[PDB]
Amino acid sequence: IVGGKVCPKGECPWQVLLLVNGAQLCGGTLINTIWVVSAAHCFDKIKNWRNLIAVLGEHDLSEHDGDEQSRRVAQVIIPSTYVPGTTNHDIALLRLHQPVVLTDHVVPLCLPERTFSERTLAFVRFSLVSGWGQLLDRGATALELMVLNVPRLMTQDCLQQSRSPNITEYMFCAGYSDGSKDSCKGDSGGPHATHYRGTWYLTGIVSWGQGCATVGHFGVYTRVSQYIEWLQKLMRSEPRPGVLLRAPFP
Amino acid sequence: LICVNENGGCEQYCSDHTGTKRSCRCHEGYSLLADGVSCTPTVEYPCGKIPILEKRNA
Numbered sequence: 001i002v003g004g005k006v007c008p009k010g011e012c013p014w015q016v017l018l019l020v021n022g023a024q025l026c027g028g029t030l031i032n033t034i035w036v037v038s039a040a041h042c043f044d045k046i047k048n049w050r051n052l053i054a055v056l057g058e059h060d061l062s063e064h065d066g067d068e069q070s071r072r073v074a075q076v077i078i079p080s081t082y083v084p085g086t087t088n089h090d091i092a093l094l095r096l097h098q099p100v101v102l103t104d105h106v107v108p109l110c111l112p113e114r115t116f117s118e119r120t121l122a123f124v125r126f127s128l129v130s131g132w133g134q135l136l137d138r139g140a141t142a143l144e145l146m147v148l149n150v151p152r153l154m155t156q157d158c159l160q161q162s163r164s165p166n167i168t169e170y171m172f173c174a175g176y177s178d179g180s181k182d183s184c185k186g187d188s189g190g191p192h193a194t195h196y197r198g199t200w201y202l203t204g205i206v207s208w209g210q211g212c213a214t215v216g217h218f219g220v221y222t223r224v225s226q227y228i229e230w231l232q233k234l235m236r237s238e239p240r241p242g243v244l245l246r247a248p249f250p
Numbered sequence: 251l252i253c254v255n256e257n258g259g260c261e262q263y264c265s266d267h268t269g270t271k272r273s274c275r276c277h278e279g280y281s282l283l284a285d286g287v288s289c290t291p292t293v294e295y296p297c298g299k300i301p302i303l304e305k306r307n308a
């Protein structure tokens with residue numbers, strides 16, 4: 001995250017850190033005790049699928065304080081329409097091997113109904129994006145979890161204000177075009193979380209952009225509302241052998 | 251009332267029904283109050299709420 005602040009410990013309790021062989025991979029969002037939503041592109045270069053770990057309750061990466069909970073990722077589910085190396089359909093549903101324990105520091109973000117998300121949440125101007133990604137374009141990643149408030153643009157206005165992949169109906173833009181404030185590499189897969197009448201909801205996934213905080217460009221986010229029914233159906237399904245699963249979309 | 255305007259007055263989710271009928275619903279871990287619109291937590295850790303802040307104003 002570029003131009004944000006530290007998320008005070010316990011104030012981003014749905015935030016997930018994904019690790020591969022102990023190394024930082026991506027962020028993700030907890031949506032109940034065994035399910036995490038992330039970005040499909042996070043897994044384009046995984047070689048050993050059995051070394052993916054999800055960490056909940058994480059805040060400061062330089063210390064252990066006992067609120068952290070690690071879990072093996074048993075399944076990575078990606079829609080059939082996603083093509084590795086590309087931007088569209090950038091979503092993954094991750095099944096943890098064992099539930100996390102909900103605590104003051106570990107709490108799921110609500111996955112909203114589609115209509116509610118489309119008719120109501122989509123018009124809430126500002127939302128929060130978070131992660132341990134780069135603090136600057138071409139710079140070091142964060143040791144403490146950062147968060148940033150960003151405004152959402154209608155796609156017509158994003159295209160008009162920007163100055164290369166399309167912005168499809170499975171995406172939306174959010175942030176600033178003055179180079180001050182953005183999500184960045186390493187924040188990929190993390191939450192874009194929207195507040196409505198006292199509760200927070202998952203509306204986007206940190207997905208892509210032209211560099212980070214590039215003047216004349218906005219951050220791009222996977223439009224989660226398009227995937228609600230797809231997600232809900234997979235969460236009611238029985239696990240299958242083999243970590244990676246491609247599932248038909250729609 | 252209709253769900254496309256002002257969320258049907260619902261705090262959370264809204265269904266339109268045949269006629270001038272609307273039903274509000276709440277996410278798992280919440281229940282709908284007798285006002286027909288508000289949602290109250292039924293568990294310690296409902297989704298989308300931040301315990302340290304909820305306690306900070308309890």
Ligand SMILES: Nc1nc2ccccc2[nH]1
Pocket residue numbers: 043044045046078082083084246
């Ligand atoms: N690593 C990886 N990620 C994929 C997503 C879709 C199809 C094949 C894939 N291989």
Ligand SMILES: Nc1nc2ccccc2[nH]1
Pocket residue numbers: 182183184185186187188206207208209210211212213218219220
């Ligand atoms: N805005 C934005 N989001 C990103 C996600 C991954 C890499 C670079 C990015 N820039």
Ligand SMILES: Nc1nc2ccccc2[nH]1
Pocket residue numbers: 291292293
């Ligand atoms: N389901 C439920 N709702 C409650 C409200 C107050 C105290 C305990 C409760 N358990």
Ligand SMILES: Nc1nc2ccccc2[nH]1
Pocket residue numbers: 291292293294
């Ligand atoms: N500990 C505890 N249990 C609860 C059940 C419902 C609402 C609030 C609650 N706090």
Ligand SMILES: [Ca+2]
Pocket residue numbers: 058059060061062063064065068
């Ligand atoms: Ca720590």
Ligand SMILES: [Cl-]
Pocket residue numbers: 236237238
């Ligand atoms: Cl099944």
Ligand SMILES: [Cl-]
Pocket residue numbers: 049242243244
């Ligand atoms: Cl495998």
